Amino acid sequence: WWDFHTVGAGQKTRAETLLSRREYLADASFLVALQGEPELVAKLSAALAKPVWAIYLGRKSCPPSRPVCEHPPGFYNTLEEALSAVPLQKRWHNEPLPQILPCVMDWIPGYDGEHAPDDAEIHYDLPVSFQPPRHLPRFVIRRELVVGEDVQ
Amino acid sequence: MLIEIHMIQNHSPANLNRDDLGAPKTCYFGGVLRSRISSQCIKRSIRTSNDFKALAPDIALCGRMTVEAALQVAHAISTHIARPEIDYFVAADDVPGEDAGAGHIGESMFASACFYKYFSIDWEQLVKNLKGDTNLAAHTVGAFLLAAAKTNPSGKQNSFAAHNYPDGILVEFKNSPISYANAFVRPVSVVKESDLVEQSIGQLSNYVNDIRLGVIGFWFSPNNRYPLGYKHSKLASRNIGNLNELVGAVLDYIG
Amino acid sequence: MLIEIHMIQNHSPANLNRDDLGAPKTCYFGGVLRSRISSQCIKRSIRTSNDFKALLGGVRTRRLADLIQQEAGETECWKKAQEILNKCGFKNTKMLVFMSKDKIKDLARIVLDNSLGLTEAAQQVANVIAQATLAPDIALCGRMLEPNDKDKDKKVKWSNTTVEAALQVAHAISTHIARPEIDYFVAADDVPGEDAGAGHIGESMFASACFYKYFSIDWEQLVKNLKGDTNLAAHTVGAFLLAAAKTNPSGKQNSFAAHNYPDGILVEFKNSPISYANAFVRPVSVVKESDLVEQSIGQLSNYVNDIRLGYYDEQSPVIGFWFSPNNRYPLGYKHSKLASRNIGNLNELVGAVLDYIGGFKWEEVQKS
Amino acid sequence: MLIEIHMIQNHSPANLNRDDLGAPKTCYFGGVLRSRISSQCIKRSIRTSNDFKALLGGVRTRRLADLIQQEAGETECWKKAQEILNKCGFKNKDDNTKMLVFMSKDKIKDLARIVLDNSLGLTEAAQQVANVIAQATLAPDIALCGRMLEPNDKDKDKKVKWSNTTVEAALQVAHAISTHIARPEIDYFVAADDVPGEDAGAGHIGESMFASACFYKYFSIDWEQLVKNLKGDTNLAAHTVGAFLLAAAKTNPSGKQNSFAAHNYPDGILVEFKNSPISYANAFVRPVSVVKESDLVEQSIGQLSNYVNDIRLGYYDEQSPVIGFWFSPNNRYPLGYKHSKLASRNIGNLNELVGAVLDYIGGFKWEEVQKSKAY
DNA sequence: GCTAAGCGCACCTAATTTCCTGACGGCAATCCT
RNA sequence: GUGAACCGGAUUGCCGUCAGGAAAUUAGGUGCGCUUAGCAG
Description:
Chain A is of the alpha+beta class. Helices cover 12% and strands 23% of the residues of chain A. Chain A has a three-stranded antiparallel beta sheet with strand order 3-5-4, with no helix packed on it. Chain A has a two-stranded antiparallel ribbon with strand order 1-2. In chain A, a hairpin with a 2-residue loop joins strand 4 and strand 5. Chain A is extended, with a radius of gyration of 20 Å. Chain B contains six helices and eleven strands. Chain B has helices at residues 39-46, 50-53, 123-128, 134-150, 196-209, 243-254; strands at 2-10, 26-29, 32-37, 71-73, 76-78, 85-88, 107-110, 114-122, 168-172, 217-220, 238-240. The interface between C and D is large, with 52 and 53 residues.
């Protein structure tokens, strides 16, 4: 969904109105799982439960409609098991369920070497500094989870 | 601590926010097209208000080139399906001529909706840039509350005099920022025995009661016109019928 | 200081506003269909009202050349007028131009009829166009116009032309559910024939509804648009009140002579604008006792009472006047005996309003 | 100056107006269902009435060629007249024009003379026909009702220019709404076969719809515009006003009157002179409920009197008083007893009321305006 | 302080599809060349 | 405070103004609420 945003900036003076168009995802829900050493995860959850600053969903005008810490941390061996363990809650009795479930997972380097194939997509979302602004590329691979095939 | 303000405002047929083509700003939610007023529109409506004009002024409340303004506002999500309409208009020539009709003969776009407005202002950072002026911070919080209650976007207002005030404002002090937009995932359908505002407030009350049952919040309605739960149980902390005492209660709870 | 006028008016079966298809204008308010009378329709009806004959001093026309040529018994200067208008920034008999009438007549006569150059004549006529805002009609409705920068000569410079409107008019929405109706008509043939049928067959559309009308006059802006002539602003406010009270949209009035007067006018003075449209989010359903107008007035009084007991400031209390013809329909009919200045005369209401704005008498404007 | 005629009249069970399905016309006034008589129907009834026979002259026909042939006599030229009209901007379907033309009947002779000559060509004849048609607005009914005429530009001669064809309407008529909850009744009829035969049944079984209601009718006549439309003929305007009053009082719509002889005269007529049009339809937002101690017509007249008093005391209290005349047959139903001063005069005769209106308008006797006849 | 029962009918026949109008007016922005 | 901090598509406008669903009609035919009684030592 697209939003037309106009900026008057500062209003010696002249008619300078910035032109902008923002893209928004309407009626979408995402689940983000981060894997790390247990103490850091516990501290991250504790600080999330007590947010010292106004958190949003990418832009200040996008507040969270559901609690970020609604799902509590737990011990799960693999990301697929964690994703399949949580049940899906239907909004009402008869609604079109998503037969295709896109997913994003970190590409495991394993041992030394094992270069990513040409079919692995690139993503520039790792910030280290903003002067000059540079984001290190990352590799993202896509997987499938389907309900009704592993649970009777 | 966090101050979260939820408003249920029903607007007369108007064109408050516009895109390039003149259509009212729209959004999608719950499988239903929904009307929308942008957050920046509401923020600018808050600014340039004569109610407040009559540290560094104009800097602490809004930054200017950091400042990291503590007030956040969500997009005004309507509780129901958007219903855009065509306003066929002509501009007369009011002189005797060889032809008739003179204006652009356009098709103005307008819609009327009951919007759910979400304002979340954090007290800690607003104190942080106020150099610890707790009294001044409370004063500016109250001024912003009054403005948001009694101000409207300055859209196409000369032809659409939409100056309706909210029928319900709910202030909570919860730790995490939770928006009640999901209360209206099911679009509100008006029934013969109820109205749109009452049904929207009832849906908000149902969402507030749910999840938690399986913090406290101040509920304000003008003269208790729309009660958020007609029971004597512990459901709402205080039912406030006047705006000024609501601001006073918020102020002495914060300080 | 804002002069807010809320009127409850019930109309006979009529079509006072329709779209291209001929059906009466409708809108959705509160999730239900409501009959609608457009804001610009009421603005024009007040504009061309018999009560605005003494204040109609602005003209909105595209054939300004015809207007200029009309003020010349034998001095045939029309091609030159069109050429100077085209070089001013209009392109064809042009786009709509809003400004005063006597001003343009006299100034065009003394400028473009004189044997002199062209580009500076365009500059002078542009300055006259921009500076002709001494009209109460422009002061109320406001205007803006920016000529295209392609056809306009670079030697012509435009001063500030945006006139901020001092009047805000809302769309008249019905207080109840809308019931569109179809009036099926024929067109009789006077000469008998071998078929005995009508000359034309069609379907007319009409609706009868109780409308809630909202007006808002900014006193400070009306005075600013008229400069120091504050008496003119008071006269404009009074004439606007009279016209809104006594003039109706000129729709299909020959076929639907719906000339009903409002049954209640609430004139309120506050520094912030309030729309009582939310009083009728729930459509008014008529019952055995009382009537549609009585129920609408009751709902409006309930909403006004909740607003007063809600958003209230002791520093600047809001005063208001209620009008009903001969006190036919009271506001607080059952318990709300709060308004101590109920009026049963429109002229008395105008006098009270004028007295509250300042030391203005309705006869005091008879001095120029 | 505006002439306002407010009429309260009760009708016998009848179907004066109906839609395509045959049901009586209805409207939703004040949130409740009412009985409606369309303004067009009342206008046609007044126009095609004995009291308005003298002030006719406007003909609204798609068969102008037939009139031209009838006026021209036995000289054929019907096809050539039709082709002249076709080039003028009135396309025909089979034999009549596709659109109605409103015109004075006195100019049919001019049209016939213009068609009949052989010296004139075709573009010239079409232009002359258009000029004659556009200038034929002298008929009083055209002055009262108005006219719009938009010729087919596509199917028109290039060298034919039309002058102004619209005349302002000097008469405003509102739809006749009922003063109470209008309940409709269904009449079950049967058609009987005179021949016995062997079926022993009926020729036809059907459903008829009728309703009885007390109607409030509102008329508005613009005196200055009526005078202007007749080009300063003040005597003709006075005659038009008087005959319009007499017709509106004395004729009814001719809809299903052979089976529903609803020939009821008005029970009260209020004539008011003012500069702005005021409709008393809001007197009946409350539907009139008949009580045992009164009558439906009496209750309607009382409600109308209360609303008229309220309007007079709350809207028309200025240096210019409003003069109004109230008519009831032999003063059968007066206005409200609580005031007894609302009307300037209480006339008990229709002719006397017409004379009073004519005298107040500019000073006019009925005899000297009826005396303008051609013979 | 309070008696009950039996009994309640069928329907043939439900009219007439192009009588339906035309015309005039519909951006002004170019928001780092 | 990470494509994110600063962030209004702002104004002008009556479709206006042409109009009879009308000429056809009997729901016409059948009929017992009817058998029982002290408001009185």
